[PDB]
């Protein structure tokens, strides 16, 4: 009867219809709904348990600059920054804190290091004047949470009262049992009822850019759940 699956921000067991993504909002700090999963017709019910079900959620943002004659090799940012689980070094991390891509030169761009104290990052390359650039740094200073919807956009409850910060979420090394993250709360729902994963943070996150090298979908969520067939 019961199984233990993973569910992702796209498709998976659902089929890309009863998922929906969305960005947050910047100027009004508000508890937006960045993702939501609706239980399809075919399942009987879905469960969700804390301290039983593992999780992963790698968000990012997007920013841009303008090429100049001066040898920049460094860019400021609008988002608080830190390393992935802490380290000054690049390529030792579980994943890159930041990625950069040049529109003109359709190539990746490495990263040397950064201050990780102010909103700063180094670039290893020397961008030319007029060249367009994009960057997908780490995100910080946010809160994440869950809530349930009974088919109508009509809340009935909340999985767990207190929000967990995405900041801390990046801080812990993920994907290690014993050190794996496990939120609290014990939810369950049935056909056409929705779980919404909600965000409260200033910086504008992303889901799709169509010019990101390390995979198509920039960010990701991967959550464990229990299903009754």
């Amino acid at each position: 009867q019961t199984q233990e699956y993973t569910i992702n921000h796209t498709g998976g067991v659902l089929g890309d219809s009863y998922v929906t993504t969305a960005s947050n909002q910047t100027s009004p700090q508000r508890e937006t709904a960045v993702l939501s999963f609706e239980c399809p017709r075919k399942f009987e019910e879905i469960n969700y348990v804390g301290q039983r079900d593992a999780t992963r959620f790698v968000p990012r943002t997007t920013e841009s600059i303008t090429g100049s004659a001066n040898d920049d090799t460094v860019v400021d940012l609008t988002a608080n920054i830190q390393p992935v689980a802490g380290e000054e070094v690049i390529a030792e991390q579980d994943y890159p804190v930041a990625v950069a891509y040049n529109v003109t030169q359709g190539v990746e761009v490495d990263v040397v290091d950064a201050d990780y104290a102010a909103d700063t990052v180094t670039l290893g390359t020397n961008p030319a004047d007029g060249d367009e650039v994009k960057v997908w740094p780490i995100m910080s200073d946010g809160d994440v949470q869950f809530r349930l919807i009974n088919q109508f956009g009509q809340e009935e409850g909340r999985v767990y009262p207190w929000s967990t910060p995405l900041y801390r979420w990046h801080d812990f090394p993920q994907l290690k049992r014993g050190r794996e993250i496990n939120l609290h709360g014990s939810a369950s729902w049935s056909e056409n009822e929705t779980l919404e994963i909600l965000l409260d943070a200033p910086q504008a996150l992303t889901w799709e850019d169509s010019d990101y090298p390390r995979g198509q979908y920039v960010t990701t969520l991967e959550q464990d759940v229990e299903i009754t067939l």
Partner: protein, 172 residues
Amino acid sequence: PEIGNNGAEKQISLHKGQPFIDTQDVGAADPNTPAVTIEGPSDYVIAIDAGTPVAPEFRDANGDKLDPSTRVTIQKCDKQGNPLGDGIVFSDTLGRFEYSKMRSDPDYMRKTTTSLMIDEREIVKIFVEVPPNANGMDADNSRITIGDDTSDYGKAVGIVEHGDLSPAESKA
């Protein structure tokens, strides 16, 4: 010379270079196609416990890892290549392995969820869900491994010859 009569329940593992296994290339957005097929040999019985390690190491044709949003699903099947909802195990994502230390590390060692059994003529498939506008799988470089022989960590795949034990038919 002298050899000990080892128990019938032999501790084994599965990989590409075997006769009762097969694979085939995959493109993009092709869930129904099994990247890898397994079948029960004749007059043998395989057993996969719930705490069995799992280890896909798929690749791209150019020699790269694929989009970690990709999904992998091991799944038991009735005969005639027919899937089933019950008995499925290991619905995981292609990311979050760290293939470098994956089999090496008991931490990175991802295990299955529930028990499993393979009667003499049965099938187990490995479906893959790649997002579009991505690179395809290359069978020359891809590989599967399951079970953990040769290590005090992890578990191993049990096997037995059907023609030895009398209640093997009852267990099947």
